[PDB]
């Protein structure tokens, strides 16, 4: 279940933690753009091309993330009901350099919004101690421009707005959810894979005692009686 086999397909149980740590999706997605882009299309055009389900598989909320106790735990009381786009948020600077945002590791429950350069350089961040801040978003002026699936092919400037996305960027692709239908709390939940695993592994671990109890109790009849 957890790793995935021919019998553990995708649209049946969802994605794997191994595809998130592997940027397995980001990869295919990229190749669909350098390929089409080089064929005479505009960035706007290329993204608007890559099928969306593909981009969905990329949102982190689809990787068995968190959830020891979250009763109904359907994914939807987490994100909400997803209805969105394969939007790529391009974060450029004041000189036009394309900034790259660092993603959140399925290990952390919370991550620090940070923007890197294409070489690994640090450009923008969201300061905690604003006093001696140097890499603010306002001091360096960032900008978000969406060349993505239909839902959002435009551009943004305000620092309050721009920022929001940075965090929602950290989750990979960006989506919009019909939160209100289930009164989602906005906290992540886990897929049937995690659930099927956590159950079946514990049970199995639990049957180890069962194997050893009944075994010895079988071969020591007289000992049992004492």
């Amino acid at each position: 279940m957890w790793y995935g086999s021919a019998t553990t397909p995708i649209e049946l149980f969802g994605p794997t933690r191994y595809q998130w740590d592997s940027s397995y999706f980001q990869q295919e997605i990229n190749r669909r753009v350098q390929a089409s882009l080089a064929s005479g299309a505009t960035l706007e055009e290329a993204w608007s091309a890559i099928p969306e389900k593909l981009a969905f598989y990329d949102y982190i909320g689809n990787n068995p993330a968190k959830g020891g106790l979250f009763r109904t735990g359907p994914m939807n009381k987490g994100d909400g009901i997803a209805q969105a786009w394969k939007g790529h948020a391009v974060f450029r600077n004041k000189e036009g350099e394309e900034l790259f945002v660092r993603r959140m590791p399925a290990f952390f429950e919370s991550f620090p919004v940070i923007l890197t350069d294409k070489n690994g350089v640090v450009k923008a961040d969201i300061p905690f101690r604003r006093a001696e801040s140097k890499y603010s978003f306002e001091q360096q002026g960032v900008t978000v421009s969406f060349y993505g699936g239909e839902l959002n092919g435009q551009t943004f400037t305000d620092p309050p707005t721009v920022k929001s996305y940075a965090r929602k960027a950290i989750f990979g692709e960006i989506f919009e959810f019909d939160t209100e239908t289930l009164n989602s709390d906005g906290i992540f939940r886990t897929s049937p894979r995690g659930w099927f695993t956590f159950a079946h592994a514990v049970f199995a671990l639990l049957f180890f005692f069962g194997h050893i109890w009944h075994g010895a109790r079988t071969l020591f009849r007289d000992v049992f009686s004492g």
Binding site: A65, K66, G67, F70, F128, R130, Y135, G194, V202, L206
Partner: protein
Amino acid sequence: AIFRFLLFFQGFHNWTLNPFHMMGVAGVLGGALLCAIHGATVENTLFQDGEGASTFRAFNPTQAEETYSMVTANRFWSQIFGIAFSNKRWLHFFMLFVPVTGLWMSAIGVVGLALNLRSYDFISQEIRAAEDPEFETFYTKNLLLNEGIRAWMAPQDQPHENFVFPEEVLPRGNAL
């Protein structure tokens, strides 16, 4: 390298809040509580004059009855603690149940974290924790320490992702 393990767990999993580790924590401390009362009760209820010299280094096979009283222990406890199931066979078995029963939980608790499935949150509280800033409980104060553990300890502790965290960015209480 093990202590670091501990801490790691506290920051990303808040393992202490897990109930399973709690029960585990129950048996281990219960194992030691038994080990004391049993061992002390015995030693101290030992039969009088069994040794003229009055030290206690003897026994034998025929010493069927053994060196101490259940009847007195019973009353001792009954009148001091209030309870005392007096039936040697139960006392010892119960001494198997507590420690062992515990570690099985604890182990269960870990099969859970293996899947980043944790007991790291109280929706109820978090919610009212965000809609209101004049409300705080130990539940909260702790969740703060964690992030501190995570921010400062993950870039040196996990070399492969190569975390670069600018001074400002780090969470930090005033003056420290």
